[PDB]
Amino acid sequence: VVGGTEAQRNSWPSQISLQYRSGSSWAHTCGGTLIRQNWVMTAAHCVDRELTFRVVVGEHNLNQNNGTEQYVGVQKIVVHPYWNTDDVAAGYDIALLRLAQSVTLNSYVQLGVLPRAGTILANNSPCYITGWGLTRTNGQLAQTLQQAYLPTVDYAICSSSSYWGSTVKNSMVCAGGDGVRSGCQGDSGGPLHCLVNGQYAVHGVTSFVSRLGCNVTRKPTVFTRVSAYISWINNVIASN
Ligand SMILES: *[C@](=O)([C]([N]C(=O)[C]N1C(=O)C([N]S(=O)(=O)[N][C])=[C][C]=C1C1=[C][C]=[C][C]=[C]1)[C]([C])[C])C(F)(F)F
Ligand code: NA
Numbered sequence: 001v002v003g004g005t006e007a008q009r010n011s012w013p014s015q016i017s018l019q020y021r022s023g024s025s026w027a028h029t030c031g032g033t034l035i036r037q038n039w040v041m042t043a044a045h046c047v048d049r050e051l052t053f054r055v056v057v058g059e060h061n062l063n064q065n066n067g068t069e070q071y072v073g074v075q076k077i078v079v080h081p082y083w084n085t086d087d088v089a090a091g092y093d094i095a096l097l098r099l100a101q102s103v104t105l106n107s108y109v110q111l112g113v114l115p116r117a118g119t120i121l122a123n124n125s126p127c128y129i130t131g132w133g134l135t136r137t138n139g140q141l142a143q144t145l146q147q148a149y150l151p152t153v154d155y156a157i158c159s160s161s162s163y164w165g166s167t168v169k170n171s172m173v174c175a176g177g178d179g180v181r182s183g184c185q186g187d188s189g190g191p192l193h194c195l196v197n198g199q200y201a202v203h204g205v206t207s208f209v210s211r212l213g214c215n216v217t218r219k220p221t222v223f224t225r226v227s228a229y230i231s232w233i234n235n236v237i238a239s240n
Contacts, residue, residue, distance in 0.1 A: 001131050002215040003181035004148035009060050009068075012130045014112030014202065015145065016040055017059045018097075018189060020051040028062055028141060031131045031190025033112040033202050037102040039237060040074075041112075042189035043205050043224065044083040044095045053077075055099060058108035061144050062132055068108040073100035078236050080229075088208045089167045093224045095189075096236050112191060112202040117230035119196075121203060123154035127175050127194035129206065129221060133187030137213045141186050150175040150182070150192070153220050163218050171228040173204040177220030184214035192223045202226055 018030040018040070030046035032055065040055050047053065058068040076098035083092040103109055121127075129150045132142045158164050158174035168174060175192055176182045183190070183206045192204030204223025210216040226233075 001129055001133055001142065001146035001148045001187055002136055002184050004146035007130060007145045007147040010107050011147070012193065013108055013110035015130050015191060017056040017062065017132065018042055018046055019054050019056060026054060028132055028186060030186065030188045031206065033191045034103070034109065035112055035114065036237065037105065038099040040097040040099060041205060042095050042097060043093045043207055044079045045088060045093055046189040047077050047079065047095050047097065048085055055097065057103050062141065063143050070103050070109065072103060075100040076240065080232065091169050091171050093207045094205055094229055096233065098240065113199060114230065115201050115203055115227040117227055119227040121152050121194060123152060123157065125152040125194055127152060127192050127203065129175065129183050129187065129192055131183065131187035131190040131206070134184035134214065137184065137215065148181040150221060153177055158220065163220065164222065168222055171225050172207065173223045173225045174220040175223065177218055179215055179217035182215040183209055183221040
């Protein structure tokens with residue numbers, strides 16, 4: 001997250017750290033959202049390789065041991081059937097990971113609330129992006145969970161010529177674009193928390209930014225629109 005601030009230790013309990021094993025060590029690669037005690041929602045482009053993964057819940061400081069962490073292995077990975085490995089622009093950037101063991105809920109680990117199917121937010125809706133991604137374009141990962149205020153840019157403006165054009169589809173949510181705050185490498189798959197009816201609901205799965213820079217003006221961070229995938233999510237979960 002570029003231009004963010006460290007989140008409070010129990011502010012976003014549904015945020016998870018998706019890590020892959022390199023050699024003997026583990027390394028954070030993407031974010032994700034706990035949606036069931038044994039299911040995590042993330043971006044398809046995070047779990048596209050045949051890597052060995054683990055999910056860390058109740059995590060705050062990537063390096064230090066906070067004492068609230070639960071590490072569980074990934075048992076099953078279900079990427080959306082229409083996801084094309086190359087294509088972040090084509091859409092369908094969503095995946096569900098079945099955990100090897102159910103996690104224990106407490107104040108540091110909670111389930112994320114999903115929007116009702118089809119829900120579209122009005123322009124400039126208040127949302128926050130969270131993650132341990134790069135704090136600067138070509139910089140390094142954040143040690144502690146970062147958060148940034150990233151209000152929505154409705155599709156009409158986002159899909160215009162001076163923003164993203166046809167790259168952004170109706171099944172995506174745009175947020176930010178002020179040139180100061182944005183998602184960045186390592187934030188992928190994480191949540192876009194939006195305040196709706198007094199409740200923070202997970203409206204997006206962090207997908208992409210401009211390869212020219214993370215915090216590029218008129219290039220808001222783009223997320224997979226969760227509300228467009230409610231039926232798919234429930235079908236997957238009901239089936240396995
Ligand atoms: C994730 O943290 C980051 N996501 C990506 O880098 C996804 N991404 C892109 O943002 C682009 N941008 S583009 O070239 O401007 N296309 C519109 C291209 C490719 C990818 C991509 C695809 C497949 C695998 C990895 C990256 C954050 C910036 C959200 C991360 F690093 F992917 F995990
Ligand atoms: Na930690």
